[PDB]
Amino acid sequence: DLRLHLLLNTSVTCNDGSPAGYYLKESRGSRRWLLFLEGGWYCFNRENCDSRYDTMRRLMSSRDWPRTRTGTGILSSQPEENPYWWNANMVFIPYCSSDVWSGASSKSEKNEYAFMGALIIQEVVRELLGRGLSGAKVLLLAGSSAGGTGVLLNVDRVAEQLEKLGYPAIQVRGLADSGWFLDNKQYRHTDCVDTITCAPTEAIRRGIRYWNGVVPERCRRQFQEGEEWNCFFGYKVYPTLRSPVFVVQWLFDEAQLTVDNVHPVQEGLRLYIQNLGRELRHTLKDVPASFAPACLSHEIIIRSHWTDVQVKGTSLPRALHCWDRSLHTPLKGCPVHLVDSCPWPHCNPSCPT
Numbered sequence: 001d002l003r004l005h006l007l008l009n010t011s012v013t014c015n016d017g018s019p020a021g022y023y024l025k026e027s028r029g030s031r032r033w034l035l036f037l038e039g040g041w042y043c044f045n046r047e048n049c050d051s052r053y054d055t056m057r058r059l060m061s062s063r064d065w066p067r068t069r070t071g072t073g074i075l076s077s078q079p080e081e082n083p084y085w086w087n088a089n090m091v092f093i094p095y096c097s098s099d100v101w102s103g104a105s106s107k108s109e110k111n112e113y114a115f116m117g118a119l120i121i122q123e124v125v126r127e128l129l130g131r132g133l134s135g136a137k138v139l140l141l142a143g144s145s146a147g148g149t150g151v152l153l154n155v156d157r158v159a160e161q162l163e164k165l166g167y168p169a170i171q172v173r174g175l176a177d178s179g180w181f182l183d184n185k186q187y188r189h190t191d192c193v194d195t196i197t198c199a200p201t202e203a204i205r206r207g208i209r210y211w212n213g214v215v216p217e218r219c220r221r222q223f224q225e226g227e228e229w230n231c232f233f234g235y236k237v238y239p240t241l242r243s244p245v246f247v248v249q250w251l252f253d254e255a256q257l258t259v260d261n262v263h264p265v266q267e268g269l270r271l272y273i274q275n276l277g278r279e280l281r282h283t284l285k286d287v288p289a290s291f292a293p294a295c296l297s298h299e300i301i302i303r304s305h306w307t308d309v310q311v312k313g314t315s316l317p318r319a320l321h322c323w324d325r326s327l328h329t330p331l332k333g334c335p336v337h338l339v340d341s342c343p344w345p346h347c348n349p350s351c352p353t
C-alpha cells in the first residue's frame with residue numbers, strides 16, 4: 001500500500017482550498033523514483049466546476065481522501081504484475097485541480113476555486129527531496145489521460161527545478177499515457193455555447209484564462225500570447241521538450257472519439273475512423289520511444305493486466321525496459337518504437353476486451 005501525506009505547505013491547495021498531497025511507498029534499496037499523475041477530465045468555468053464539485057468531489061478536494069491506496073500496474077511492487085519497475089520508490093499524486101496540471105492561481109476574493117496543478121507538482125518534488133529523492137538516479141514523471149498531458153506540460157519544469165536546487169545528477173524522464181490528442185475535424189459539429197458542445201480547442205482556450213494556466217517556455221515562445229492552447233496538443237509541444245519522453249497512445253482513443261462526436265458502420269464513418277488512425281500514426285512517425293496499438297480503449301499503465309497487450313510481439317513493460325537500456329545504437333531484439341500499421345480497431349488480437 002501507498003500512504004497519504006498532505007502537503008506541509010498548506011497554501012498549495014486543491015480546488016476548494018483543502019491541502020493537496022501525495023501517496024508514497026518507499027523502496028530503501030532503490031535509486032529509482034516513479035511519480036504518477038492521475039487524470040479525470042477538467043472544468044473551465046464556474047457553472048461546470050460547480051457541477052463537478054457535486055458529483056466528482058474527490059477530484060476537487062482532499063477532505064474525503066483515504067489514508068492509503070493500493071498500487072496497481074506500473075505502481076505495483078509485485079514483479080508478477082509489474083515486470084518493469086517493481087522495486088522502485090512509488091508516488092501517486094491525486095488530481096484535485098481540474099486544470100490538466102497547468103494552473104497557478106489561488107482561491108481568493110476574486111476566484112471561487114484554486115487551480116494549482118503546476119505548483120502541486122513542484123511542491124511534491126520539493127518535499128520528497130527530504131524523504132530520499134535527493135539520492136535518486138532517475139525520476140520518471142508518468143501519468144494517464146489528463147495526467148499524460150500533464151507530463152508533457154511539466155517534465156521540463158521538473159528538470160529545471162532540480163537543476164536550480166542543486167541536484168544535477170538526477171535524470172528526469174517522462175511517460176505520457178493516453179494524453180496525445182489531435183485538434184482534428186469532428187465527425188459532427190456544434191458551436192461552443194455550453195460544456196458539451198465546446199470543442200477541445202475552445203474549451204482549453206477558455207480554461208487557460210480561468211486557471212492562469214502555464215505551458216513550457218520554448219513552446220510558449222513559438223505560439224506567443226493568446227495561442228498557448230497549442231501547447232496542450234502532444235504533437236505540437238513534444239518537439240520543444242528536452243527531457244526524454246516515452247509516448248503511449250491507443251490509435252482509436254475513446255476520449256478522442258468522444259470529443260469528435262463519434263459513438264453497423266456506414267461508409268462515411270468508416271472513412272472517418274480509418275483517417276483518424278492514419279493521422280495519429282503520422283504524428284508518431286518521428287517519436288523514437290512510443291507504444292501505439294490499434295485498439296479502441298483509454299488509459300493503460302495502472303491497470304493490473306497492462307502486461308497483456310503487445311505490438312509486433314513486444315509488450316509495454318518490455319518496451320519500457322528497452323527504453324531504460326537505450327538511455328544507458330538500437331538494441332537487438334529490444335525495440336522502443338512500436339506503432340501498429342493495421343487500420344481498424346481490434347485488428348491487433350491482443351487488444352483489451
Ligand SMILES: CCn1c(NC(C)=O)nc2ccccc21
Pocket residue numbers: 039040041042100145146149179181200204232233255256259
Ligand atoms: C480529448 C480531449 N482532451 C484533452 N485535450 C488536450 C489538448 O489535452 N485533454 C483531455 C484530458 C482528459 C480527457 C480528454 C482530454
Ligand SMILES: *[C@@H]1O[C@H](CO)[C@@H](O)[C@H](O)[C@H]1NC(C)=O
Pocket residue numbers: 009011012119123
Ligand atoms: C508555499 O508555496 C508557495 C507557492 O509555490 C510559495 O510561494 C511559498 O514560498 C511556499 N511556502 C513555503 C513556506 O515554502
